[PDB]
Amino acid sequence: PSMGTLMGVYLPCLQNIFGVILFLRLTWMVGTAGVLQALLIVLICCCCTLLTAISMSAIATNGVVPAGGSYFMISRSLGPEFGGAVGLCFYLGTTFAAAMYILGAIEILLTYIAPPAASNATLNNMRVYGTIFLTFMTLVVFVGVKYVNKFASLFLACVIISILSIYAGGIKSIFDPPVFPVCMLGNRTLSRDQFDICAKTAVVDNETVATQLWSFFCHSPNLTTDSCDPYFMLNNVTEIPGIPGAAAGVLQENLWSAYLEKGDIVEKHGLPSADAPSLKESLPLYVVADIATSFTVLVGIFFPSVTGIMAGSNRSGDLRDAQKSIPVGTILAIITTSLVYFSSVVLFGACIEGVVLRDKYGDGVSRNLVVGTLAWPSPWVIVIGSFFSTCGAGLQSLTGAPRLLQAIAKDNIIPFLRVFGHGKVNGEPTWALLLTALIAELGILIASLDMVAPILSMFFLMCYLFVNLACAVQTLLRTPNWRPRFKYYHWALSFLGMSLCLALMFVSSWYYALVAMLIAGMIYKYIEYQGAEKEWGDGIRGLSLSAARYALLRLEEGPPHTKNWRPQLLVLLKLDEDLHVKYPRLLTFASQLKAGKGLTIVGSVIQGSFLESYGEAQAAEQTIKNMMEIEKVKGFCQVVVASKVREGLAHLIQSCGLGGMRHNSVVLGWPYGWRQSEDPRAWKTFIDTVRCTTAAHLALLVPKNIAFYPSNHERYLEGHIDVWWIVHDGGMLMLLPFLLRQHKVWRKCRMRIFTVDDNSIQMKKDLAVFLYHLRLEAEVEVVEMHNSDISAYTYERTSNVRRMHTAVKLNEVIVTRSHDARLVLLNMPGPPRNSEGDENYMEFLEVLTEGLERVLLVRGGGREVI
Amino acid sequence: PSMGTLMGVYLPCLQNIFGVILFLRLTWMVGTAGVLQALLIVLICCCCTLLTAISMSAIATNGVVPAGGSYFMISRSLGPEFGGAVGLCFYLGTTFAAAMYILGAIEILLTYIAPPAAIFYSNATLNNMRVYGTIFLTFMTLVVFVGVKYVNKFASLFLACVIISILSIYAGGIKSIFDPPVFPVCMLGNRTLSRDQFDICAKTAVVDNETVATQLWSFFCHSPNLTTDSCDPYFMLNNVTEIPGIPGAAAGVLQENLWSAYLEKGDIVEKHGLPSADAPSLKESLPLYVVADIATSFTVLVGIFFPSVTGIMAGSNRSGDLRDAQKSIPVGTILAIITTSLVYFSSVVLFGACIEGVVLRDKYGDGVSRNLVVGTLAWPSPWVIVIGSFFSTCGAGLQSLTGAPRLLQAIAKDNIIPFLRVFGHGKVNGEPTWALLLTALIAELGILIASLDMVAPILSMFFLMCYLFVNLACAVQTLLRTPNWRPRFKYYHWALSFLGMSLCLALMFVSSWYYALVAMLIAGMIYKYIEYQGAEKEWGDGIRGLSLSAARYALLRLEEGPPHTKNWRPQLLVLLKLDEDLHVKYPRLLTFASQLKAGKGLTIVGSVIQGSFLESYGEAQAAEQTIKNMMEIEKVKGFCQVVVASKVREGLAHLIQSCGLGGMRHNSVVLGWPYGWRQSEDPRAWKTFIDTVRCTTAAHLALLVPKNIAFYPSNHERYLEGHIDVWWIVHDGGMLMLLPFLLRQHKVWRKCRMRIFTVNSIQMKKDLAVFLYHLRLEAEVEVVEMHNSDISAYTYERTLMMEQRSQMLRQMRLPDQSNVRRMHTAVKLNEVIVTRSHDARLVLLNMPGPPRNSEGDENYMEFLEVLTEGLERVLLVRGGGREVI
Ligand SMILES: *[C@@H]1O[C@H](CO)[C@@H](O[C@@H]2O[C@H](CO)[C@@H](O[C@@H]3O[C@H](CO)[C@@H](O)[C@H](O)[C@@H]3O)[C@H](O)[C@H]2NC(C)=O)[C@H](O)[C@H]1NC(C)=O
Ligand SMILES: *[C@@H]1O[C@H](CO)[C@@H](O[C@@H]2O[C@H](CO)[C@@H](O[C@@H]3O[C@H](CO)[C@@H](O)[C@H](O)[C@@H]3O)[C@H](O)[C@H]2NC(C)=O)[C@H](O)[C@H]1NC(C)=O
Ligand SMILES: *[C@@H]1O[C@H](CO)[C@@H](O[C@@H]2O[C@H](CO)[C@@H](O)[C@H](O)[C@H]2NC(C)=O)[C@H](O)[C@H]1NC(C)=O
Numbered sequence A: 001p002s003m004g005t006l007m008g009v010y011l012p013c014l015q016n017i018f019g020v021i022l023f024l025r026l027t028w029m030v031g032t033a034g035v036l037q038a039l040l041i042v043l044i045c046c047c048c049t050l051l052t053a054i055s056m057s058a059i060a061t062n063g064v065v066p067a068g069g070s071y072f073m074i075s076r077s078l079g080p081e082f083g084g085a086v087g088l089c090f091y092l093g094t095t096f097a098a099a100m101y102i103l104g105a106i107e108i109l110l111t112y113i114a115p116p117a118a119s120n121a122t123l124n125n126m127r128v129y130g131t132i133f134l135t136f137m138t139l140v141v142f143v144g145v146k147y148v149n150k151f152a153s154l155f156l157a158c159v160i161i162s163i164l165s166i167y168a169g170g171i172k173s174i175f176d177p178p179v180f181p182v183c184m185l186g187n188r189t190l191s192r193d194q195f196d197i198c199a200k201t202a203v204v205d206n207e208t209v210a211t212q213l214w215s216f217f218c219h220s221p222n223l224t225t226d227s228c229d230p231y232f233m234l235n236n237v238t239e240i241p242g243i244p245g246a247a248a249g250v251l252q253e254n255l256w257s258a259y260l261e262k263g264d265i266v267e268k269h270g271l272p273s274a275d276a277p278s279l280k281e282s283l284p285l286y287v288v289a290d291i292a293t294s295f296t297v298l299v300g301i302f303f304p305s306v307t308g309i310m311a312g313s314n315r316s317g318d319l320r321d322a323q324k325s326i327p328v329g330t331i332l333a334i335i336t337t338s339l340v341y342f343s344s345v346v347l348f349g350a351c352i353e354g355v356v357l358r359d360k361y362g363d364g365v366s367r368n369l370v371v372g373t374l375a376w377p378s379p380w381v382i383v384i385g386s387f388f389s390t391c392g393a394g395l396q397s398l399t400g401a402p403r404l405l406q407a408i409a410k411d412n413i414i415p416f417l418r419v420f421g422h423g424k425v426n427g428e429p430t431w432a433l434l435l436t437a438l439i440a441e442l443g444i445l446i447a448s449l450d451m452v453a454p455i456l457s458m459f460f461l462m463c464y465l466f467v468n469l470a471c472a473v474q475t476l477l478r479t480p481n482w483r484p485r486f487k488y489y490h491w492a493l494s495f496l497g498m499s500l501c502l503a504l505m506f507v508s509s510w511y512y513a514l515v516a517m518l519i520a521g522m523i524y525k526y527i528e529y530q531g532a533e534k535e536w537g538d539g540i541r542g543l544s545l546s547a548a549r550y551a552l553l554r555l556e557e558g559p560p561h562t563k564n565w566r567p568q569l570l571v572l573l574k575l576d577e578d579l580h581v582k583y584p585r586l587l588t589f590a591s592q593l594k595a596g597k598g599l600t601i602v603g604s605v606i607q608g609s610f611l612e613s614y615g616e617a618q619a620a621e622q623t624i625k626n627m628m629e630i631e632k633v634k635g636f637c638q639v640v641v642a643s644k645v646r647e648g649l650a651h652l653i654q655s656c657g658l659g660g661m662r663h664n665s666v667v668l669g670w671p672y673g674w675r676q677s678e679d680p681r682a683w684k685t686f687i688d689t690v691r692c693t694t695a696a697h698l699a700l701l702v703p704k705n706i707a708f709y710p711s712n713h714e715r716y717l718e719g720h721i722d723v724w725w726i727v728h729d730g731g732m733l734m735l736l737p738f739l740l741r742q743h744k745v746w747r748k749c750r751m752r753i754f755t756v757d758d759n760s761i762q763m764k765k766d767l768a769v770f771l772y773h774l775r776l777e778a779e780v781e782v783v784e785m786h787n788s789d790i791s792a793y794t795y796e797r798t799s800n801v802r803r804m805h806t807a808v809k810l811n812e813v814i815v816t817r818s819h820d821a822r823l824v825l826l827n828m829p830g831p832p833r834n835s836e837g838d839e840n841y842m843e844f845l846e847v848l849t850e851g852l853e854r855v856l857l858v859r860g861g862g863r864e865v866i
Numbered sequence B: 001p002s003m004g005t006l007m008g009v010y011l012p013c014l015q016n017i018f019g020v021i022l023f024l025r026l027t028w029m030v031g032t033a034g035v036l037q038a039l040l041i042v043l044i045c046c047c048c049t050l051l052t053a054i055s056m057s058a059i060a061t062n063g064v065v066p067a068g069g070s071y072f073m074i075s076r077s078l079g080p081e082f083g084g085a086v087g088l089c090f091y092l093g094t095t096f097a098a099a100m101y102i103l104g105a106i107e108i109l110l111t112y113i114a115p116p117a118a119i120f121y122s123n124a125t126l127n128n129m130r131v132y133g134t135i136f137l138t139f140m141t142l143v144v145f146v147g148v149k150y151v152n153k154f155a156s157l158f159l160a161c162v163i164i165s166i167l168s169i170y171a172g173g174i175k176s177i178f179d180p181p182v183f184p185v186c187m188l189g190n191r192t193l194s195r196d197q198f199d200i201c202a203k204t205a206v207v208d209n210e211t212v213a214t215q216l217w218s219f220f221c222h223s224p225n226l227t228t229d230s231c232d233p234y235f236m237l238n239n240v241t242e243i244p245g246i247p248g249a250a251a252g253v254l255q256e257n258l259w260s261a262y263l264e265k266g267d268i269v270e271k272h273g274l275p276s277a278d279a280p281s282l283k284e285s286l287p288l289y290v291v292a293d294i295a296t297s298f299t300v301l302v303g304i305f306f307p308s309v310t311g312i313m314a315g316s317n318r319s320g321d322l323r324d325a326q327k328s329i330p331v332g333t334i335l336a337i338i339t340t341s342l343v344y345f346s347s348v349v350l351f352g353a354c355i356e357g358v359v360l361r362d363k364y365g366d367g368v369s370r371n372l373v374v375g376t377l378a379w380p381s382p383w384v385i386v387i388g389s390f391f392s393t394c395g396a397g398l399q400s401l402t403g404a405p406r407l408l409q410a411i412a413k414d415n416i417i418p419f420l421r422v423f424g425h426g427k428v429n430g431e432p433t434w435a436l437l438l439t440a441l442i443a444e445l446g447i448l449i450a451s452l453d454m455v456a457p458i459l460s461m462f463f464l465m466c467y468l469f470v471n472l473a474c475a476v477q478t479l480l481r482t483p484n485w486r487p488r489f490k491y492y493h494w495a496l497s498f499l500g501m502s503l504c505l506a507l508m509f510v511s512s513w514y515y516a517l518v519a520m521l522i523a524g525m526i527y528k529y530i531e532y533q534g535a536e537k538e539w540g541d542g543i544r545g546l547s548l549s550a551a552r553y554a555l556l557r558l559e560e561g562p563p564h565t566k567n568w569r570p571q572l573l574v575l576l577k578l579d580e581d582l583h584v585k586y587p588r589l590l591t592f593a594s595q596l597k598a599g600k601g602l603t604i605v606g607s608v609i610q611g612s613f614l615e616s617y618g619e620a621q622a623a624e625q626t627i628k629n630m631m632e633i634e635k636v637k638g639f640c641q642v643v644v645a646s647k648v649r650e651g652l653a654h655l656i657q658s659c660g661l662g663g664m665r666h667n668s669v670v671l672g673w674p675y676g677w678r679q680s681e682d683p684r685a686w687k688t689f690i691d692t693v694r695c696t697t698a699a700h701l702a703l704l705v706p707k708n709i710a711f712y713p714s715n716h717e718r719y720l721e722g723h724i725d726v727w728w729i730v731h732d733g734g735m736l737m738l739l740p741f742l743l744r745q746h747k748v749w750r751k752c753r754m755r756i757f758t759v760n761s762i763q764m765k766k767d768l769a770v771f772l773y774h775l776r777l778e779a780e781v782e783v784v785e786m787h788n789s790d791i792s793a794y795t796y797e798r799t800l801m802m803e804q805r806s807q808m809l810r811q812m813r814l815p816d817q818s819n820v821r822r823m824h825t826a827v828k829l830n831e832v833i834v835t836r837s838h839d840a841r842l843v844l845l846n847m848p849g850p851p852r853n854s855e856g857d858e859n860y861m862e863f864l865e866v867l868t869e870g871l872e873r874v875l876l877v878r879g880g881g882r883e884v885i
């Protein structure tokens, strides 16, 4: 499969864009709204579609492009939810567009080609003929798709020849225009259909006689009468040319808005008219404004002529290089359409009279196509051209909507429309064509372009808005599979497009837009629910599972370092032989340090064998969950069954969490009665866990004397927290007391920073400035720093007899200056590298915290920033 | 602290609801829209507020009630995001309510009490309103700054004034029923003259025995002589009448003003039902007819009326001083709502049935001699309602200026929004300092509009936004089963909150769509900003913090509830085996996992690395990166765990039983096959395999053992001709049937034929078919018969048993018929299967369980090996026992 850019993307988009709006409702819109507001409307209607094209290109470049069609790309790149929701709005837009083309073909057939073979009489004629055409076209679509696919080029050829003839006619108008006199009465517009000639009196047989216009306006067939309307006799009868050759005087005339009302009269601003009352038997003789015109009405009526940019990306499979051929083709088609509309708006505004443009059905002229008056070969080419264009566009929409419905139905996303996949032997849908025809019937029964157009606009605006919103969100939140390769693409453009198309969608009709948005939201949430039920098994619990998995997958990619550091704890509880929580104060302390916000996993090891001890593990899981719910700490609970507690602890420390939801702090208790008993298990297990948690670059919190920690019901009124930051680990040693006091239990305990040659003023200024950002502003008291005393910390981080001496002097200082303290925090030195000096390290740590009622030791990990 | 329901909740709510809208704009609203549509308006505006009150009660019952106020309950019960968003919309509503009350007090001062004291006399009225409103706002701000205590003392007085005013109105009506008052309004044809200028409404009067033109003549006709014919035709063509303006209660007047009478801007107020002969008129007469001031419709009346039913959140404002709040707040709020609704209904009907249809439409009471239209019917004198409404408006304004800065100060001290930290700098006593100034500035910006009919819709928009948010939050938290949300209200159901949200949204859009859009965007912006700040405070980063918070919330919500799903879908854990150089040995397992999941579901990929953790951290990190790259290649979306154990066995066990977080657990273990187990002398392989099998079968997990993984297709390969074979023997039918369907759903097996081979036959086939109908696979069913004692003994089987004995002897160095019987059966089964299913693409058969004795594993391996002998690709599945489908 290989065809170029032109005949694969460009020409289909052109064939889909050029519609009936140009022929039937451009002149009326230009005359009613002027040239300025016309240019503003065209610009507004091209900007939304251009930003949507930018989003479509950004979608069409990331990754490979699926070869199925124009709906499969959207789904593959935005998820089944988005793709499914977009498909239905697009399907409805396409079927109503087919309906609108049928109405246009009927209107062009019954008004100019042949009116004899035909208020509400027109509405009934339109209804009947539109139903007959819809039936015949549906049957044709059933039987003869091959002939449509063969003849599809002809419709584009006719459109191109028509537009070329219009522009050539304009150029011939510039120096020698055609003649099409429109008659005037003062500053009113007479319907030229009835009268033979517009003149009050005519000369027959050497004398003057009343003309048909007189007898039609005056019921008397004798000139000698004075029972007629005052407007007829008071004013004159003029014949101004309707096609003034290109000049700057006409473009000066029709330059300001001319919004009429329902039932008003089409008036030629710039002719002498003396007002007067009038009878009621004359109204069937003036041309009348048919519908109320405004700005929003014109937006709604014109918009369906710039839609169809998603029909270009429809031969993805038979493309040479889609990444470079789809975006350029779409944007070139958009630009070409925008320039044709700009040029046509200016040409119409500046070349034709401002009063003959407002006859929607060409009443000023003798029931001709108002836009067909200027055309070189003959005014008869535009009628046939627009007829074939409307028929071809209707046929192609009726061919392309059921195929899309069958595609959506076989994907099995929405379950209640499984039947619509009952394709033919060849694959052509069977019970989807009937549904489409029924919807087309429901649309034809309205039988008025000016009322079908706003619904169509709502559907297409909804589709485009959803595409743009999806692109913007997926670019913002770093979706895992979303990286576009487009050069001129930035999510700000898609955001602006979403805003613009939403503004249009609400300008046209607020209630219609609300209904469309509610339908879209309902289908979106229903797709999400069904997908959850299909992946996992349950509805609500499935929703929660899907949200969790999506969030974790999105969090996987990206730099794995956070600019700030907050403790996320893993509380290692130690269950008893009877499966009871030994120290329920660790859970209380964890709840006080977290305050119910953050991540808190609670692991525990049970010695034995997994093969025969599963129920014990589950029972312990329930026990820990209950005890954890009581103390009001919101966290998960893991229980593992190991053979020896050492390896269980290791596997728990290095493997807990899912991807980015990892812990970064291990809070383990203190070993009690280690020196009393002869079994040395306790201290070796403790030191081994310490050595294993410092090699994983994790913080460490060892609350000593856990039997004196407060409960939640207790309250403190007088007391002062004590910090004894010695040398290193400053960030977390300063961050802990603040997070602690953030709880009501320590709500007002005074903080005192004690910091063990050097300069006290520079140090004080640094500590104070650092505290300024934190805002704790706690008093700083720096005691003397003796290098000989801290030798133990300096040598181990970066002498056994010396160890004890330094520890006893430090303990003396702290116990004489901080004995009555509430909580004492000091950073502990690292364990020795030699595996045998563990007894000395334990004796050091024990004689260091001798006397303090409540002492918590923290060891930094080294990757802490603040 | 303990005070009852009445004097603690009921009276404050009553005092906050009854406002200035009733007096200044009730009669005008009733006359313009008729009685029926007025009742409909009142009903619509009471239903939204009633449903919001029910939701507020459901909020006020769950748990303990915080003693702070009306904002702390909402926050504690709905989360910082919701609570913060509600606080700002409520704050804006309260400050604009203060603005509206000041406007009402100014209007009542300049129009009825004393009109001479008007600086400007169009736009003169607007300029007078602007100046006087600014002066009042300044003076009220100073008073509120200095004297909050006296306000809290005098708060009862305002309610006393309101109650006496309403009682006087009803007394006037009841006195109207049998003997009404006198208030003649003069008429011209069918128009309405301003009675202020003329002395008497009569074209001519008799003075000194003769008739002379009256002031009305000189005002309508510039000539002071009767003998003139240069006046407008309407005056001479129609007579002048003097109808009573207060007709006593009857069914004829309530029958007259019963249908809508929406006028337009600048039209004339006409009395439908009087003889009128039309004619042209001059342009110097318009200053003498009463004129409609603004264009009237239905939506305009909804917008103007809504601010008279707001304030139901002021009842839950003495939370601390309550006896038992759970039983005292809802009943108090709902009783206040019911009383207000009944008073409005009764007053609408009374006005409709007691006053003329032409004097209701004078917004400023022009038909009567510049009186308060509602004050015409009042027993003691029309002077009680004027002063009553004046003092009530001042008091309500003062209380709003007292209660808005307090709410702002609470929000500022709560530290949710960071840029308004300064607004918590209260005085030494706690009275706000820089929150009062901001409130006064916003109130001035609101006064500069100077028109009740334009200020009321903004107020309504803010309050409607607050209520819609409360209702939506309540409904969502009840639906999704939030962990800490269990309300105790008896008559409460999430359908009611949903209906309330819909109705109040409809109201929010009827008044003015664009204003509603602006309000919704402000609310959404503050909601997302609060969420972002909470993320930055809990975790450390902005964007990544959002994802972590979403994950934690979802897992926590999924924690509670029944832990069994009605369906069973495989969630795999692929146990890869890394090489000695840390390279993936079998990268085909990842391919198979990607084909079986198809990128949707959970897939954890664990692996054990032998050694010591203390010195092998970098190896673990490198292996994790390697697995991530290799996993990205095979297009499988999953997480990756690597642990460092001492023996691979315990690593595998700890990996099997501990992977995930709460409810996001796996339920299927796919491990490969051990190759060369009997070839080599090291027996580690088969014991490791058997140990993992027994450990994964005792946890009730499914099992997938793809044998001969080197012949499985890749993703680029495609299959055109072939048929999957299932050889389901006895049990585990559900999963044995669910696997091939999920398999063929991938394009690699997109069209492989399924054949069900099953070792009364017709009844079983009918059952399989009916079961298959729901699944819809419709695969052909062939039931093969089962033979007995086909081969009594096999010589080769005996030789194999001897070989096994020799193996055991070698192991020792460094009943045969009964044991053989099982091998013989396996040989016969392998014969049938290999002769009827050799050419199959993929073969699935369920494997027997491992033996209970830990030593008979060698025989089990020999059995499993001779079973799949010859088959190119064979996958064995073992059920866990808790599988449902
Ligand atoms: C303005 O007021 C006058 C008088 O109050 C209204 O005209 C009165 O209409 C009644 C009803 O027909 C007349 O009663 C009878 O009129 C006939 C006419 O010939 C007379 O023959 C009878 O003897 C009897 O008077 C009454 O005369 C007539 N009065 C006048 C002065 O016209 C009039 O309808 C009111 N409304 C307007 C002028 O729009
Ligand atoms: C109050 O007095 C005014 C002034 O005469 C009355 O206005 C006129 O009342 C008639 C009552 O039907 C209206 O009749 C309509 O006339 C049009 C022709 O313009 C006709 O097409 C309709 O079918 C109908 O017959 C008339 O429009 C109206 N004219 C004006 C300028 O107001 C008015 O009706 C009297 N009553 C009330 C309740 O206003
Ligand atoms: C066309 O004729 C109508 C007939 O009156 C003109 O209408 C008048 O326009 C003047 C100009 O301001 C107004 O003051 C009158 O009140 C209008 N009378 C009516 C009955 O409409 C109109 O201006 C003429 N020219 C146009 C429409 O361009």
Ligand SMILES: *[C@@H]1O[C@H](CO)[C@@H](O)[C@H](O)[C@H]1NC(C)=O
Pocket (backbone or CB within 6 Å): A235, A236, A272, A273, A274
């Ligand atoms: C009507 O036409 C006559 C003759 O052309 C002319 O004299 C007269 O002024 C015209 N009326 C007006 C209002 O221009």
